Scaffold this active site. Structure first.
Site, short mmCIF file in Angstrom:
data_model
loop_
_atom_site.label_atom_id
_atom_site.label_comp_id
_atom_site.label_asym_id
_atom_site.label_seq_id
_atom_site.Cartn_x
_atom_site.Cartn_y
_atom_site.Cartn_z
N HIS A 1 0.95 -1.18 0.04
CA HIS A 1 -0.09 0.11 0.08
C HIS A 1 0.91 1.30 0.01
O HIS A 1 1.59 1.54 0.79
CB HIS A 1 -0.83 -0.13 1.28
CG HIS A 1 -2.08 -1.11 1.16
ND1 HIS A 1 -2.28 -1.68 2.42
CD2 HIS A 1 -2.66 -1.50 0.34
CE1 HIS A 1 -3.27 -2.47 2.00
NE2 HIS A 1 -3.62 -2.37 0.67
N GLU B 1 1.76 3.72 2.85
CA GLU B 1 2.37 3.47 3.76
C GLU B 1 3.79 3.64 4.05
O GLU B 1 4.37 2.86 4.19
CB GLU B 1 1.78 2.09 4.20
CG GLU B 1 0.35 2.10 4.48
CD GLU B 1 -0.17 0.71 4.37
OE1 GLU B 1 0.12 -0.39 4.52
OE2 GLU B 1 -1.62 0.88 4.22
N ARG C 1 -2.70 4.71 -2.37
CA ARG C 1 -2.86 3.50 -1.74
C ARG C 1 -2.54 2.36 -2.83
O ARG C 1 -1.95 1.52 -2.56
CB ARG C 1 -3.94 3.08 -1.04
CG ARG C 1 -4.20 1.80 -0.49
CD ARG C 1 -5.52 1.68 0.02
NE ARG C 1 -5.90 0.64 0.46
CZ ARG C 1 -5.81 -0.08 1.66
NH1 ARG C 1 -5.04 0.52 2.63
NH2 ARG C 1 -6.38 -1.32 2.14
N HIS D 1 2.97 -3.61 6.87
CA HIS D 1 1.72 -2.25 6.42
C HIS D 1 1.72 -1.33 7.54
O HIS D 1 2.44 -1.49 8.64
CB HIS D 1 0.52 -3.10 6.35
CG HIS D 1 0.16 -3.94 5.18
ND1 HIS D 1 -0.59 -3.39 4.17
CD2 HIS D 1 0.62 -5.18 4.94
CE1 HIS D 1 -0.81 -4.31 3.44
NE2 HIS D 1 0.06 -5.38 3.68
N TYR E 1 -1.32 1.63 9.19
CA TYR E 1 -1.26 1.49 10.57
C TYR E 1 -2.12 0.93 11.35
O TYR E 1 -3.13 0.45 10.84
CB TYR E 1 -1.03 2.89 11.03
CG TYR E 1 -2.40 3.69 10.73
CD1 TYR E 1 -3.28 3.51 12.07
CD2 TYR E 1 -3.15 4.22 9.52
CE1 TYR E 1 -4.54 4.17 11.77
CE2 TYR E 1 -4.30 4.63 9.36
CZ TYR E 1 -5.34 4.60 10.60
OH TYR E 1 -6.24 5.13 10.24
N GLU F 1 1.07 -4.38 11.23
CA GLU F 1 0.56 -3.18 10.94
C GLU F 1 1.36 -2.10 12.06
O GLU F 1 1.03 -2.34 13.06
CB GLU F 1 -1.06 -2.92 11.22
CG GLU F 1 -1.91 -3.60 9.95
CD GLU F 1 -1.95 -2.75 8.79
OE1 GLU F 1 -1.50 -1.57 8.84
OE2 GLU F 1 -2.65 -3.12 7.79
ZN LIG Z 1 -1.66 -1.81 4.31
#
Ligand SMILES: [Zn+2]
Length: 303
Positions: free
Chosen positions: A67, A70, A125, A194, A196, A268
């Site tokens: 993504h 990120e 993203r 990833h 968050y 994350e």
């Molecule tokens: Zn992500």
């Protein structure tokens, strides 16, 4: 040199790609750069292979930046790459890992999106593929995998942030990893990075079905989160994707686990929402350091 590279700031695609070459040139016996595909817009897709020899030794996969917005993930990837080269021959545990296993590190898993976050839209993203019957661009590359593809926990709306794409593996950024991991055939861990939320997650996202290795992965995750927390007190939750955050379909670790890659986890990273995707540069190094402790803990369990 990678000694003068600024790890406490965010970098562009070209800077990260040039960093890869510098690191390989500095550590040619430890690190090599593999091109695993080309992005939709034709940019090379690169993985760093860290290895001390052997022939397709048991391996750990790590993807970052699938993504694109990120940014803490690509920045963490760069730090990881440097850290691997520093710690091999210095840290007993990590040296033991690399003496028996290879690590494949994909710092910029979605290069087209990453370039877009620098040139056009910081919050981009998705990939940059163009949906033929649509004014909308891009697919959520972590909903495009062949694991519950198109099921609840993704969107069929092409303009959506969570659009799964037309079919599983439609995105070359995803298919490149799938092919590489399948061709390799000896991956033992598969870690997707990833942001968050501060979560360490194991499968599944697409189904409430408990994985057969749930007891083991749950304890690995517990240990990893404790290790991560030990540095700065950063608190992570852990559990399956679907129980811990939300149902999400077409995801990377659901796919990898279904291939038989047991130690499949999604991190994350920071934070929990204060800055969200716009994590300040001043948190890059502390985030990378603590995350490394968690990742190393998983690697230790993989052995
Ligand atoms: Zn992500």
């Amino acid at each position: 040199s990678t000694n003068t590279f600024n790890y406490a700031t965010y970098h562009t695609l070209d800077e990260i790609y040039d960093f890869m070459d510098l690191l390989v040139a500095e550590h040619p016996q430890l690190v090599s750069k593999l091109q695993i595909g080309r992005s939709y817009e034709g940019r090379p897709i690169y993985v760093l292979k860290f290895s001390t020899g052997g022939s397709n030794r048991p391996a750990i996969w790590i993807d970052l930046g699938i993504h694109s917005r990120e940014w803490i993930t690509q920045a963490t990837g760069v730090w990881f790459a440097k850290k691997f080269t520093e710690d091999y021959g210095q840290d007993p545990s990590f040296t033991a890992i690399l003496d028996s296993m290879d690590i494949f590190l994909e710092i910029v898993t979605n290069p087209d999106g990453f370039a877009f976050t620098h040139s056009q839209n910081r919050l981009w993203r998705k990939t940059r593929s163009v949906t033929s019957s649509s004014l909308c661009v891009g697919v959520d590359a972590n909903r495009n995998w062949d694991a519950g593809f198109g099921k609840a926990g993704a969107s069929s709306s092409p303009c959506s942030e969570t659009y799964h794409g037309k079919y599983a593996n439609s995105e070359v950024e995803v298919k490149s990893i799938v092919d590489f991991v399948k061709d390799h055939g000896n991956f033992k861990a598969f870690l997707s990075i990833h942001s968050y939320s501060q979560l360490l997650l194991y499968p599944y996202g697409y189904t409430t079905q408990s994985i057969p290795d749930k007891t083991e992965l749950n304890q690995v995750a517990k240990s990893a989160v404790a290790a991560l927390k030990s540095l700065y007190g950063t608190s992570y939750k852990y559990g399956s994707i679907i129980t811990t955050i939300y149902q999400a379909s077409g995801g990377s670790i659901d796919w990898s686990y279904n291939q038989g890659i047991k130690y499949s986890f999604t991190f994350e990273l920071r934070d929990t929402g204060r800055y969200g995707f716009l994590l300040p540069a001043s948190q890059i190094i502390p985030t990378a350091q603590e995350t490394w402790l968690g990742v190393l803990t998983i690697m230790e369990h993989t052995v």
